[PDB]
Ligand binder design. Structure first.
Ligand SMILES: COc1ccc(-c2cc3c(C)nc(N)nc3n([C@H]3CC[C@H](OCCO)CC3)c2=O)cn1
Length: 879
């Protein structure tokens, strides 16, 4: 139609490839995902059309609230008798006069209540009903829901900062006048035997093509469930280099009905010299998306080995053929049985599980042989019930012995009483034994829900089973707040890579939330779009992006304006670091200024939302405040006017650093971990102010960085002014009076926060230029080069003098680092889980579980609470 043709050009621009291309794809799964996902779209749109227009407003401007309405002790204490002084603004008459009405009201007042007092003060300022809404002055953040005022992140941040909230009052009708009439349309594309196989698995390696020049070669194979072999790996015969025809059947120690649902064939072409090397790799799901077992002739196009691969295989790697067909192509053959073999229905598995529990009970009783895996009733002693608990308290990095596994499995029915043990019991299963797997399925089917922070662990590369991942999704669906879903969004987008198929419970969950919360949808779009360059995820992420863009609504027009901006800056910074690299900042700036005269450039680089915070409107480009930086990759310091009616009450200008050349993924993760550490310390009552500024990767070593206003590096404070006493005097000068005592306190609390953080994460070398200080004393670190692969933030005499060595303030400071280290140690399981989910991300500083182990060392998990306290105590004295 007319609208369908306009939509597809808009979707195409957003993804970076035309939609017609997805149709010219003959994979039934691709076309099934495309059609079968459409109900997740339908449900999301329906929820937005439910309480229209209010429900459409909640979509476009979701309330930005904290997870709990409860405030910590140190936060509540800042309120003058549990009450907050709030400032409500009104835009009066035709001359748009800003008029403030100050209040002092209960921090837990709902926005409809706050409005009432503001109308009461307006009616009294001389001596209406609820057709109004509250907005943050200077940004598009609204207060459309009945939450305690202190629950909104702006209000809580204000309390924390000792800043007075500035909110603007406006008509509900004036906001709804900005929400357009969106319509969802149905696209043009929308309109056996089971365990009866009494046989062992064999796979024929026929031949290899596109394998030529540059001693011998072979095909290394293995059958895997996650990253664990379901039997021993089987190699083909060694063969001369250019001639690769094996025509060999490989015979595996697995009986076909014993194959788990998420069983994979993991293969690689290896070179020999004593020194075996993988040339290419590829993995195949033994069952297709429809539960059908792979049969017959097949050809798999192979992938290049990832930089820094362990063994000769890549089990954690992507499944399916490499799209580039000019690559090593391996031709295989699978046994064809009586008909089309299909994995049994849940009911057949349910009956076999009941049969297995029965045969298990009458097995021994009447066996004669010994079994450490048979379940025994009444034989569970209180000293071993307390030993089972000690297992559940173990970190995800800790090794679980074969004895502990047999122990855990014989107690599989008790385990249901310690629900947080499940990841360990799931590892304890003999995943190559249909008998135990059918039984495990029924346990999960009725397993007590676990916390989302625990659920997430069952979504890394170790838990491939659809039932295990389905239960994890179910725990998130019911217990994960939007605040928290937003906080862990980069790991949830990352673990999508561990999914066997396009259509799954996780993608369905993530997409429903994306299409019912625009703040989630923004970052869901950007985290997906930023990996379109990566061919390993291009199709899955592209299809996910198509389904998103097809139902997001008018936000696509906003996303496309953002895409056009980043594309211009990439083009711009390409020319500077290529051609005009050694040219002066005046000539380089003359080129930018000449390019800004161009219409396509002055439309693109102005009047669009900030990808770091879509609540921020980037108006006119103030070139006069922009500069090409001195850094090697020629990054841009960019300055935009804040076109908000009340910009002045937040920030009149918005500064973003656009960088093209370096990987921002490692900074993205370090800044996320900081936000988390900060939120852990804050929840535990100890106020250690951190600054996880915005950093977003938009592609292949391209991204944006939030500039922190009123900040200078440690070097800049030393330089303009060898010198070791300048910092304190500068902070005394920038905070003279009673204002000084607050600044010294904000420097120590922030200085303590970064001391712990950097130590734990093993962050890159911290110097005078890698550290920064705000006008109020707030200390923060920047450019986190590389983590894990020592105390990097060495407290020099410079920082020590600002603290007040044998002082009362330094005795308070040490007590700040100590509680903080204990606070992170009590949460090490979460941090371990966040890094594990990122293994799939191609990050060099995080390629194996060995890398994550660094935080088991620095957080002394194998030691005790007092022992680890002694570890941090000892490591902090060595400077
Ligand atoms: C991963 O890549 C990167 C690249 C840049 C930054 C980066 C962040 C930053 C922030 C958040 N806030 C403020 N205020 N400044 C900042 N800077 C400035 C440092 C001083 C410099 O001054 C000129 C040379 O001395 C101007 C730039 C940065 O570089 C961080 N990570």
């Amino acid at each position: 139609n007319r609208e369908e043709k306009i939509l597809n050009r808009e979707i195409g621009f957003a993804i970076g490839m035309p939609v017609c291309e997805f149709d010219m794809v003959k994979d039934p799964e691709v076309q099934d995902f495309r059609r079968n996902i459409l109900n997740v779209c339908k449900e999301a749109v329906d929820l937005r059309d439910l309480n229209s227009p209010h429900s459409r407003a909640m979509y476009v401007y979701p309330p930005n609230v904290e997870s709990s309405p409860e405030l910590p002790k140190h936060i509540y204490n800042k309120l003058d008798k549990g009450q907050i002084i709030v400032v409500i603004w009104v835009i009066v008459s035709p001359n748009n006069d800003k008029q403030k009405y100050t209040l002092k009201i209960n921090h837990d007042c709902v926005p409809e209540q706050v409005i009432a007092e503001a109308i009461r003060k307006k009616t009294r300022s001389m001596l209406y009903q609820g057709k109004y809404i509250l907005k943050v002055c200077g940004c598009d953040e609204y207060f459309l829901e009945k939450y305690p005022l202190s629950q909104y992140k702006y209000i809580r941040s204000c309390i924390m900062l000792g800043r007075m909230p500035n909110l603007m009052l406006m008509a509900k009708e004036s906001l709804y006048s900005q929400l357009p009439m969106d319509c969802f349309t149905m696209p043009s594309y929308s309109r056996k035997s089971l365990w009866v196989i009494n046989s062992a698995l064999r796979i024929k390696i026929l031949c290899a093509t596109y394998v030529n020049v540059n001693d011998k070669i072979y095909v290394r194979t293995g059958i895997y469930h996650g990253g664990e072999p379901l039997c021993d790996n089987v190699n083909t015969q060694r063969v001369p280099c250019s001639n690769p025809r094996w025509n060999e059947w490989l015979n595996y120690d697995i009986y076909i009905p014993d194959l788990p649902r998420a069983a994979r064939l993991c293969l690689s072409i290896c070179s020999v010299k004593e020194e075996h090397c993988p040339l290419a790799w590829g993995n195949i799901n033994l069952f297709d998306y429809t539960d059908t077992l792979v049969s017959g002739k097949m050809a798999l196009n192979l992938w290049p080995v990832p930089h820094g691969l362990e063994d000769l295989l890549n089990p954690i790697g992507v499944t399916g053929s490499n799209p580039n067909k000019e690559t090593p192509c391996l031709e295989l053959e699978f046994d064809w049985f009586s008909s089309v073999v299909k994995f049994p229905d849940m009911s057949v598995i349910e009956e076999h599980a009941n049969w297995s529990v029965s045969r298990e009970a009458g097995f021994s009783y009447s066996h004669a042989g010994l079994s450490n895996r048979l379940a025994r009733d009444n034989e569970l002693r209180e000293n071993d019930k307390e030993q089972l608990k000690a297992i559940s308290t173990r970190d995800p990095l800790s090794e679980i012995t074969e004895q502990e596994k047999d122990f855990l499995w014989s107690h599989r029915h008790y385990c249901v009483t310690i629900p947080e043990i499940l990841p360990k019991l799931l590892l304890s299963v003999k995943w190559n034994s249909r008998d135990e797997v059918a039984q495990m399925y029924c346990l999960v089917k009725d397993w007590p829900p676990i916390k989302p922070e625990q659920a997430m662990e069952l979504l890394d590369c170790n838990y491939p089973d659809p039932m295990v991942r389905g239960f994890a999704v179910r725990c998130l669906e019911k217990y994960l707040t939007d605040d928290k879903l937003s906080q862990y969004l980069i790991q949830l987008v990352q673990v999508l890579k561990y999914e066997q198929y396009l259509d799954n419970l996780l993608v369905r969950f993530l997409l429903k939330k994306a299409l019912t919360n625009q703040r989630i949808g923004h970052f869901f779009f950007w985290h997906l779009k930023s990996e379109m360059h990566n061919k390993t995820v291009s199709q899955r992420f592209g299809l996910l992006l198509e389904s998103y863009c097809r139902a997001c609504g008018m936000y696509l027009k906003h996303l496309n304006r953002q895409v056009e901006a980043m594309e211009k800056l990439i083009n711009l910074t390409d020319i500077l670091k290529q051609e005009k690299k050694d040219e002066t900042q005046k000539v380089q700036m003359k080129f930018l200024v000449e390019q800004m005269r161009r219409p396509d450039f002055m439309d693109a680089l102005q009047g669009f939302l900030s990808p770091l915070n879509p609540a921020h409107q980037l108006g006119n480009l103030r070139l006069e405040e922009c500069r090409i930086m001195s850094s090697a990759k020629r990054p841009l310091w960019l300055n935009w006017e804040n076109p908000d009616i009340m910009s002045e009450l937040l920030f009149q200008n918005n500064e973003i650093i656009f960088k093209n050349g370096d990987d921002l993924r490692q900074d993205m993760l370090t800044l996320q971990i900081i936000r988390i550490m900060e939120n852990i310390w804050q929840n535990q009552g100890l106020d250690l102010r951190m600054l996880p500024y915005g950093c977003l990767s938009i592609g292949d070593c391209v991204g944006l960085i939030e500039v922190v206003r009123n900040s200078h590096t440690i070097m800049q404070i030393q330089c303009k002014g060898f010198n070791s006493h300048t910092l304190h005097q500068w902070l005394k000068d920038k905070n003279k009076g009673e204002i000084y005592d607050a600044a010294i306190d904000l420097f120590t609390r922030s200085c303590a926060g970064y001391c712990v953080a950097t130590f734990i994460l093993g962050i890159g070398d911290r110097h005078n230029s890698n550290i920064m200080v705000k006008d109020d004393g707030q200390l923060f670190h920047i450019d986190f080069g590389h983590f894990l692969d020592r105390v990097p933030f060495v407290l020099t005499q410079d920082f020590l003098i600002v603290i007040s060595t044998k002082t009362r303030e330094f005795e308070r400071f040490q007590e700040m680092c100590y509680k903080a280290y204990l606070a992170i140690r009590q949460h090490a399981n979460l941090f371990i889980n966040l890094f594990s989910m990122m293994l799939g991300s191609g990050m060099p500083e995080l390629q194996s579980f060995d890398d994550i182990a660094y935080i088991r060392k620095t957080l002394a998990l194998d030691k005790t609470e007092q022992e680890a306290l002694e570890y941090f105590m000892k490591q902090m004295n060595d400077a």
